[PDB]
Assembly symmetry: D2
Amino acid sequence: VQATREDKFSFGLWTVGWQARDAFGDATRTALDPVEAVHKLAEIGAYGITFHDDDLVPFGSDAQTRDGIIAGFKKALDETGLIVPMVTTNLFTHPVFKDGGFTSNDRSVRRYAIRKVLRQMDLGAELGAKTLVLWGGREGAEYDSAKDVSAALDRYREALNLLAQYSEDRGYGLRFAIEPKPNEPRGDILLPTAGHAIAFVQELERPELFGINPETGHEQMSNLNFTQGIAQALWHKKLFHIDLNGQHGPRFDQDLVFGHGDLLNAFSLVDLLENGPDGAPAYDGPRHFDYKPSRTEDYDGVWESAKANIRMYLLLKERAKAFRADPEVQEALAASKVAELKTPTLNPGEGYAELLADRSAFEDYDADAVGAKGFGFVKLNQLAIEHLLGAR
Amino acid sequence: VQATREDKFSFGLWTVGWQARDAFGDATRTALDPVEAVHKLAEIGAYGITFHDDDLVPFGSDAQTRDGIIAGFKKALDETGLIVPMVTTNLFTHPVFKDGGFTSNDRSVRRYAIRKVLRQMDLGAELGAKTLVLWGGREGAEYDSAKDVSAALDRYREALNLLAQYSEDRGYGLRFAIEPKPNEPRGDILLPTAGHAIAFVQELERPELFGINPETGHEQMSNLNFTQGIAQALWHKKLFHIDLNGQHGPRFDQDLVFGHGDLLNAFSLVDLLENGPDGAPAYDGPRHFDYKPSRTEDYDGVWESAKANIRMYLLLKERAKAFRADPEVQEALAASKVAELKTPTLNPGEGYAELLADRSAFEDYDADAVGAKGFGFVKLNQLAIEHLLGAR
Amino acid sequence: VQATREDKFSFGLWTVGWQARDAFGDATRTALDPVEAVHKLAEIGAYGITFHDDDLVPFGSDAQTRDGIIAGFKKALDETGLIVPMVTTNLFTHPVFKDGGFTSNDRSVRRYAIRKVLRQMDLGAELGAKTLVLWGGREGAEYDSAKDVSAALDRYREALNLLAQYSEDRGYGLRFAIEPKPNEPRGDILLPTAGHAIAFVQELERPELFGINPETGHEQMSNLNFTQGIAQALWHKKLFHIDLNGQHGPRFDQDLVFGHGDLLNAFSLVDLLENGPDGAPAYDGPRHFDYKPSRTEDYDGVWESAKANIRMYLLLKERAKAFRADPEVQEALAASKVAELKTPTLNPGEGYAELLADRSAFEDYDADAVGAKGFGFVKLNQLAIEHLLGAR
Amino acid sequence: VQATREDKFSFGLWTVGWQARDAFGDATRTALDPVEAVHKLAEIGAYGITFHDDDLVPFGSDAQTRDGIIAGFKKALDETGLIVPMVTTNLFTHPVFKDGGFTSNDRSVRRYAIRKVLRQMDLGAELGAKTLVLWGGREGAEYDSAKDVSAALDRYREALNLLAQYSEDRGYGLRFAIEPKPNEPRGDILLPTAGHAIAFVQELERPELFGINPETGHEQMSNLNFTQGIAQALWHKKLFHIDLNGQHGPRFDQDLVFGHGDLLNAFSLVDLLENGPDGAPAYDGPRHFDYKPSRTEDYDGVWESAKANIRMYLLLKERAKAFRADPEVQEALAASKVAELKTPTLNPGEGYAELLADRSAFEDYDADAVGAKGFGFVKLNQLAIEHLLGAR
Ligand SMILES: OC[C@@H](O)[C@H](O)[C@@H](O)CO
Ligand SMILES: OC[C@@H](O)[C@H](O)[C@@H](O)CO
Ligand SMILES: OC[C@@H](O)[C@H](O)[C@@H](O)CO
Ligand SMILES: OC[C@@H](O)[C@H](O)[C@@H](O)CO
Ligand SMILES: [Mg+2]
Ligand SMILES: [Mg+2]
Ligand SMILES: [Mg+2]
Ligand SMILES: [Mg+2]
Ligand SMILES: [Mg+2]
Ligand SMILES: [Mg+2]
Ligand SMILES: [Mg+2]
Ligand SMILES: [Mg+2]
């Protein structure tokens, strides 16, 4: 399998560029040049690159430096044909954001965090980015009495409403994607799951401009089913972007290559995104990898890991397609009544009164008899794993 | 401290009545008589009792039987002065519900599930209940290919819209509270956290009628901060009811007495619920205990465990109040800038244009200097714990 | 592929026989006749069957009844050629065991538990069983002050020493396997992981007769690496038996078909067991499936699920074999230096004196240059998964 | 209360000296001077200080500098009266240890790692340290095929045997304490729990010289009961040292102040360590705090957090003693039969022959009557908690 620009694989500059300085050790790799990253990614098949303001322009560069950097990066994109589908802002690294950006208890920090993002929005718009991802990594707490959650959601909302106002007024046409994470680096982060993030967005001034950027590992850190979470996000039409990676349950954020953590869930996920209604994907945006090349690797291992993400995604896609195309799967699906869930429970024009008058729905219903029929779900599941395994 | 009707402690018939038949062993206690339950609960200070249809009327009782039981029950309520603030429906025990009630793959089960709930709505209406709790315990799956989540949400929505229509046409005035649970009995349950449930409710036809019934242990099964999810629910104004109990992280659902699991979080929760806005509670509904007397206990143990729930709450309430009235705490709160979060980030009439014109919010902002000042959060936490321990 | 007696696949009578009564619902299936279970298992390729005393002979059956059941069971065995490689005792279902068997706080229960086991040893010995599995499911506590752990371990040891004595004196030649589990049904179970069980066994009077019976999902309930724990069990030479199944991290005990939980760990487990040192398997006992057919299934789903366990094991075995016979994998292993771990750190006859004298081990060691070399682990992991996916 | 030297509270230099650089952000505090650290800790009540070689002497320090630093340090200890009860070696920070120290796939690194420890043993013996703590933070893997566990355990053993040989021959009199941790920084670390570590130690050449150093947070990262594991550690007589801190279940290692995570388990732990048999503590070593002052704090917050550790331990101690001394508790303990567990199951001189002859242990045992009696565990738990809340 080979990647095409239509696959829409994107990578964050901070992914292949991670120097591997973890919580217990020093960096094991040297810094990666943005221009070189552009060339190497173009080379392995990516269609786009993303970055945090501070990944491209060192925090505190003068305008002369900032400008030179932007010019060079812009050239590289030019020469390679890579686009910038999304940009994000770093509101977590600098010590000033130790209690958050938008929700820091310190008012001055909140004013500053907003300005930092407005600026990144400008650059984003200039490079043609369409999505602004917001990962509130420091919004949250270690102790319950330290953060008024209500006040915090008010301030989170105040800040986002201004951002949409600005984008709309400047005609940027950005979409905003809130990225949920349950913990790390704060003891607990606000808007911990895809669900909490969706509920929150529904309360903004222009909710139509807002959605989520869920990440595989983030939902897995809570032992949640990532595919089912995405399915819900799709039902709401709030899946604006997606970060793919691997994780092994509730533990520190691993950021493994996509499919190197929960493989079975990685499979059902590609199936969901690609085998959409009427053949077409159910999702049209970037297939963004927010992962980290393991600390035990060098630059060779880095490029290898970048390609492993693409490989994993295309090998799974290939098996999801075959799963669905298999007449034996098709028969097991019918036996399990998976599609019967699509038929309304109620008949056309039927309401409570017609339902209450239907004796077959209650008075004459044989619950014991229906309760004994099997659904044949183990067999259908075994058919899926055999396709995954390349055994069918 | 002693319980008053104003404390609003309620218990489910199924809590003290749990015979302790678990996944690996037989029941260790004989059945509890409902009238007896009512009399005993009245005695320990409960102001209300709740029940699933099947807890009071054995599945399949003829109408004469059913009628007989309801009349005895109402009499016990009458004699003791206990009310029924909420009722619910058992859509999980009978084999017919093995794949769900409202979202079973089987259309006939779905129709039957609605009829079972309508019937319970009529009895709740009859007893004066104000809330209908819906715990979709069998809605979900063990395998990703077995359940079309999108269609499941459509059918979940279809069923709820009908229930609201009916209540509203008959003038029942019920409020509906969806109870989220991440797993057990299904590998994964639909609407797994408080967040997922709130996002869902915002998509119904009469949203104002729907909220959630979050459970301490259910959010903890995913390692989430219960107090923090309750704060968000309150922020959305969707906290319609609450189920209190104890749990020790992600493992099977323990249903311990409130405060016997994560005690620190039990403390911050009571503080949040009672030390509300004015001086008044932030929440006005029933403090419902959805717990189980451990399998090792006989009926003396059951009544002790019921009392323990009430004692934990009142003991926590007393320390929450003392914490807040402490001048040393007020001082720590001022140093940590907790209240500063409540002041808008922007000055009245300030927009993005005024923020961009403020050089002090960015160009002349000394991030380094601000990033060096500590928040004094540990100290504040330490004062909170010392209040919990009666050390101050 | 097809299973052979040489594969040594065994099933507990309680797996295919699970009536599917869970913590929240009634059984969805009727009881399975033991004789019929023997015939069906023989037919799908099992080499053996195992059972708890109470699975075969209903608790409290008079001697004539028991004798009768046993005789019919033996006939079925004879007729099919299946063996009974292991037997176990139910010390968890009856209310009497609510606080444990060997470690109940009540002395009379501890005496009765031992007698129940002696009786099962006799029957095991008569059926030719070589292993007695001990799963102390009720040994533990819900509350810290309710159980004296030190006293519990003494009582535990006291019971086990007696059983070994009896066995040795009767010439039964049994081997004893303790089965660890972290929780469920007790809040916390004694000897929670394979490590704790092994350390305990080392303190018995005759440690050589004792090992462990680790279960896939039990270690995963604690989010531990099952394969790595089996590796340590093998290092200690204490892997006496193994229970294979599937689990999705920390949550209730799911007991899915082997491979339907963490697929990547199932793969590396089959690799460890079969591609042992010297071509041959590293482990030769039974490959026992301790799982449960999902509650949504009927008897067809039950046999399908029984065959899925064997299929899963044989498919992974085939891929594990191909993995190792791949010259590219071999090249990647040499680059990752996996085998170099097997070479002693010290040279032959070298001690601390010689080591202290080797300047190349410290004084002239270039930590920094060594630290920059990559291990190629990601690429090796990618090749493993490509084999698993049948992509190579 | 007030800490005394008899309380034996110790802290590592790396605790209060943690600069607060986490996986997602820069240091928020300046470096702490070791002499100042000695002085500050002496002031708050610590009786000892501990450190990693690299905490004191910067990696790659010339002999002159190293010596310079030690001499200043010894003077500070002299002056303050603080001792060094334990020393440890950093085998996790430098890039050369990316794949481990003692079990690195690379043989040259294994040799270097032993040299680095030998050198710390010398400094430790010189400062009067009693225990050598060994935390194998990089021993493990991210991918199963990358590490031969059996070979890794051989090399781990090989290195330890040598260190013991050396210490014995130089007459240093050290005890070695292996510190288990389930994950972080490696995906999976070797010897993941207290159990696995004890089992391992039992396989060394001079096992009497090896024990464990369990850490509260480490066992909780796997959702295990810390108190119960320490109780097993004490039963085996392998509790050579203990690391105290707080954690909120399975997530990144938080390193909170002791008792700031699972408060109920912190209570039961203090009870176990202090209300030992013969009135006296069951444990007599250092009460060492391996925690981290939150990133949101300045140097004032740092000293506050250091003192919080001592206060938590002494407030808990005080309540555990009150608890045991309460007559109502004594009554509850009796009804729960906690002490009956200490009486042998068998009468003195009884063996299996006499047990088999006792009809009252089986044939005439009424399991049903015994199964109906409750143990009063909830009431007992409720009393423990009221004691912790200062409510009695
Ligand atoms: O957990 C880290 C987060 O995933 C970030 O990579 C965001 O996506 C970008 O700030
Ligand atoms: O996990 C069990 C659930 O909490 C139920 O008790 C509901 O609250 C009512 O069906
Ligand atoms: O968790 C259930 C246990 O694994 C049992 O199946 C034992 O293996 C035997 O009693
Ligand atoms: O999680 C890290 C470890 O706990 C260390 O602090 C050790 O105890 C000393 O290497
Ligand atoms: Mg991440
Ligand atoms: Mg991300
Ligand atoms: Mg509930
Ligand atoms: Mg519950
Ligand atoms: Mg099991
Ligand atoms: Mg088992
Ligand atoms: Mg430690
Ligand atoms: Mg730690």
